[PDB]
Design an enzyme around this catalytic site. Structure first.
Site, short mmCIF file in Angstrom:
data_model
loop_
_atom_site.label_atom_id
_atom_site.label_comp_id
_atom_site.label_asym_id
_atom_site.label_seq_id
_atom_site.Cartn_x
_atom_site.Cartn_y
_atom_site.Cartn_z
N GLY A 1 2.27 6.08 10.06
CA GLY A 1 3.29 5.73 9.41
C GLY A 1 4.86 4.18 9.70
N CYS B 1 3.45 1.51 9.29
CA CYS B 1 4.20 0.25 8.34
C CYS B 1 4.37 -0.28 7.88
CB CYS B 1 2.67 0.80 7.15
SG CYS B 1 0.78 1.53 7.76
N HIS C 1 1.04 -0.94 0.02
CA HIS C 1 0.02 -0.13 -0.22
C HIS C 1 0.46 0.95 0.03
CE1 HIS C 1 0.14 -0.57 4.67
NE2 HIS C 1 0.00 0.75 4.54
C1 LIG Z 1 -3.26 4.55 10.74
C2 LIG Z 1 -2.48 3.38 11.29
C3 LIG Z 1 -1.86 2.44 13.19
N1 LIG Z 1 -2.59 3.98 13.67
C4 LIG Z 1 -1.64 2.04 12.68
N2 LIG Z 1 -0.78 0.90 12.14
C5 LIG Z 1 -1.44 0.93 10.26
C6 LIG Z 1 -1.21 2.46 10.33
N3 LIG Z 1 -2.19 2.55 9.05
C7 LIG Z 1 -3.49 1.86 8.84
O1 LIG Z 1 -4.06 1.41 8.37
C8 LIG Z 1 -2.98 2.50 7.06
C9 LIG Z 1 -4.45 2.18 6.16
C10 LIG Z 1 -5.26 1.65 5.81
C11 LIG Z 1 -6.46 0.68 5.16
C12 LIG Z 1 -5.11 -0.34 4.48
C13 LIG Z 1 -3.59 -0.99 5.15
CL1 LIG Z 1 -3.18 -1.95 4.65
C14 LIG Z 1 -3.42 0.73 5.37
#
Ligand SMILES: Cc1c(N)cncc1NC(=O)Cc1cccc(Cl)c1
Ligand SMILES: Cc1c(N)cncc1NC(=O)Cc1cccc(Cl)c1
Lengths: 304, 304
Positions: free
Chosen positions: B143, B145, B41
């Protein structure tokens, strides 16, 4: 979201760990620049630990008696000196992996990460608080002596703790990096009283703010309190008295959540007086005091 | 003595973290040999995340659109491919800090350390369990990820998790290093059900053995139980059913303490039926399930 008992990344400290052997005793040392720091009891045998005369024991040792090994690499010892309860072994090679560092003496109630080591090799990393009575509730076995506690501020490692011993009660005692013990302890195999401990009130409040930030809000109530009233409750429950200095460092969390510090004190007062009622806060069924207000902000903002 | 929620030393993994930017999205990547792994992503904008067609989005990207930075050093991307939910960016330079590593898909109930990172920089390290429902209760912000989960076996890092997303419930989901999600999750901004979770019974029993080893023994009783009887209690309390495979891996702890596995099950049965009575075990007021039997042995024996 989520809130974990997070340690600092340990890589910068792993690069400093060495094994120090003197006679038949092996423990861990910290190699920064051209000096290796380790607990002075590396010079003792088991019989010596009853009441060691460290000055006399160290007089029987020469540079060549201190065997320092950085994994594979053998360091050449060109000087030795005792500073309080640490030995400083001057080596002929500066550690190429020395991070930017400082030696700091932390206050009781502050937190730090410990890199537990055995034979100069890192075993694991965990976060803990220096108790108000200057002990740490660590996880340490024989051979862990010389493992260090530290904090990191971007690229700078502030070393605050070197592990020396386990008290008969199973809690841990150690020194700053100048070899001064935290607390009343001495490096001798003698039963030693650790003071009455208390709960770190400002850290419990910081953790309640972390809970609100992460969505655990059931403990918020319609009440407020005063510093005086709250401190009567803190005294009854063996909590550290809260001061305006503590209220001041909680300011950022109060501002982020919109919950005035004394209103959070009223929630903490109700939790102390009523318990958790079989409920949890951030996956804990007790009031957690190992997160400072700075830790909560750092974890909740993602500082690197 | 003492027992902490200990993470593996993170140094070997810190040396692998890089920042990956594609368009206006930046996340973390893992640089092993001449490949950088990151969540696919990274190629999406916010509008794309509603229902991304990853194949079409990746067709609009060329090697030069993937900006990979290892702190200061900029990596030259010479190939890109998508494998399940990960991108693999071939770079022209092998990471000089690549540790010996493996990619493993862990089972639910197993534990691992997470090195939380932002913009390619490590923030902190914590230990956690993969829940039986394939979520992790991490501490992650936007961030994070691309941050990875791993275990270490002497010099070998087994990477088991790459972080992808936070579910609307605040729990976390991610993939193995081949990009296969743990659990039913998909990398899309859609509400997604995580299964009913359960408590990892074999880990609670391992942690009760850790408590006995460390001197917390108040919960030991004069009773025993059978696997069948215990499993009726486990079902009532949403615990994983205990099998002979679980009893077998608890053998070393049973041997070290002299407490038969079914006698420890009887202590766990009484704790489930009666609660803790306002008492604690290893500083916890709830039954802890984030330590496997292997973790307890490793921590209690000081493995490096
Ligand atoms: C915002 C966040 C937090 N707090 C913790 N961990 C990760 C995130 N990032 C996300 O969830 C962004 C996202 C949206 C939809 C699908 C996918 Cl694969 C990734
Ligand atoms: C045995 C141990 C454990 N379990 C944890 N941590 C440390 C140890 N080592 C000791 O306490 C050995 C020792 C004895 C008396 C004084 C001093 Cl300074 C050191």
């Amino acid at each position: 979201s989520g809130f974990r008992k997070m340690a600092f990344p340990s890589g910068k400290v792993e690069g400093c760990m060495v094994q120090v052997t003197c006679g038949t005793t092996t423990l861990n040392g910290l190699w920064l620049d051209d000096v290796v720091y380790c607990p002075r009891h590396v010079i003792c045998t088991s019989e010596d630990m009853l009441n060691p005369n460290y000055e006399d024991l160290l007089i029987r040792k020469s540079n060549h008696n201190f065997l320092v090994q950085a994994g594979n690499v053998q360091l050449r010892v060109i000087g030795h000196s005792m500073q309080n309860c640490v030995l400083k072994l001057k080596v002929d090679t500066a550690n190429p992996k020395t991070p930017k560092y400082k030696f700091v003496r932390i206050q009781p109630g502050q937190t730090f990460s410990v890199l537990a080591c055995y034979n100069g090799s890192p075993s694991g990393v965990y976060q803990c608080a220096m108790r108000p009575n200057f002990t740490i509730k660590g996880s340490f076995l024989n051979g862990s002596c010389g493992s260090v506690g530290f904090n990191i501020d971007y690229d700078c490692v502030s070393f605050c703790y070197m592990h020396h011993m386990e008290l008969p009660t199973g809690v841990h005692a150690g020194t700053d990096l100048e070899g001064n013990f935290y607390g009343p302890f001495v490096d001798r195999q003698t039963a030693q009283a650790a003071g009455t401990d208390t709960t770190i009130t400002v850290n419990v409040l910081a953790w309640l703010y972390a809970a609100v930030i992460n969505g655990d809000r059931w403990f918020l109530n319609r009440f407020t309190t005063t510093l005086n009233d709250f401190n009567l409750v803190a005294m009854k429950y063996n909590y550290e008295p809260l001061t305006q200095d503590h209220v001041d460092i909680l300011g950022p969390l109060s501002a982020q959540t919109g919950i005035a510090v004394l209103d959070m004190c009223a929630s903490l007062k109700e939790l102390l007086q009523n318990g958790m009622n079989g409920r949890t806060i951030l996956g804990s069924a007790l009031l957690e005091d190992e997160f400072t207000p700075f830790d909560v902000v750092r974890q909740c903002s993602g500082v690197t």
